Each structure stands twice: as C-alpha cells, then as structure tokens.
Design a protein around this nucleic acid. Sequence first.
DNA 1: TCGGACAAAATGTTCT
DNA 2: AAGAACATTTTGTCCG
Lengths: 75, 75
Amino acid sequence: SHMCLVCSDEASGCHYGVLTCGSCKVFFKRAVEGQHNYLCAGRNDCIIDKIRRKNCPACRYRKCLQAGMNLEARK
Amino acid sequence: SHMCLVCSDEASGCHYGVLTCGSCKVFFKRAVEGQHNYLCAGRNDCIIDKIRRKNCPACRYRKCLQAGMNLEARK
DNA sequence: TCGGACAAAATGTTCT
DNA sequence: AAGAACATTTTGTCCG
Ligand SMILES: [Zn+2]
Ligand SMILES: [Zn+2]
Ligand SMILES: [Zn+2]
Ligand SMILES: [Zn+2]
C-alpha cells in the first residue's frame, strides 16, 4: 500500500499514473525526456530494488513502462 | 594488444599489473582503497564493455580481480 | 606508471 | 502529483 511498484522502496505517492518512490519518479521523467540508449548487461531481467535499481537503467525503465507510467497521465 | 582487458575500451597502459583503460584503472583503485560491497542485479556474469561497464560495479570489480589487477604490482 | 585534482554523468532529496 | 533547484554518488580525463 506504500511500496514503490518499480523498486519496492518506500513510495511517496502516485506519480505519472503509478505508485512509486521519489527516485523512480524523477528517473522516469529523465528516461523519457532525455536521450540515452540504455542497454542491459544481463538477460533483460535484472532485479530492481532499493540498492540494485542503480545498476540497470534499462531494466528500471522497462519496469516503469510496464507498470504503466506515462508523462501525460494527468490527461 | 591495445585493448583494456576489463572492458575492451582503448587501453592507456599497463595499470596495477594489467593492460587497462584509464577508467578501469581508477575504478579499481577506488574499489581497492575503499569499500566494494557491490551487489549484482543479474547473475554475477554481467557483460562489461565501454557503455555497460557503468551498469554493474560488482561484476566490473570481479573482472578486475580475475584479470589479476593488484595494487602492489610495482613494488 | 601512479595518483591528485578537476570534470562530467547519473542519481536522489527538498521544497513549492 | 509535478517539477525546479540543489545535493550526492559514481564515473571518467587531464596533468599550460
Ligand atoms: Zn522506486
Ligand atoms: Zn538489466
Ligand atoms: Zn576498461
Ligand atoms: Zn553483475
């Protein structure tokens, strides 16, 4: 009820359509708006938790999108 | 040879006993001088190349050790 | 070579 | 729920 759905950290509230923490909220906006081409170094199935969420932006971003995060969600 | 044995970027010379780039040189020094309680988000065999070497410090440090890097290489 | 200082990228928190 | 500003962590380059 107060776990980030992306990294399981303590969730602040609902951001861009999904219960997430502050760090995943800002990560998501940066991933969408910025140009990076994230690439997984594993098997496209990395564990994303409070510690490990720094280790694979590709899998973190993929999880944000799959949980349904969207920038224009207030519309 | 002219390629870093850890990440396959252009090597800048032989550092801590091994042909490596400057980024792997300082990454290793920082890991050995400091803490290196890193956690892999995959299965401890992450691919370490020029872009993905940022992803997993745990597997990067393992690759430095496996290549034989050591601080007292000189003396 | 090795390492300090500087610089940049990447991530996270506070405040409105 | 959203985003600007700041702060920290992590990484990489220069060394007129
Ligand atoms: Zn999160
Ligand atoms: Zn991954
Ligand atoms: Zn390297
Ligand atoms: Zn790994």
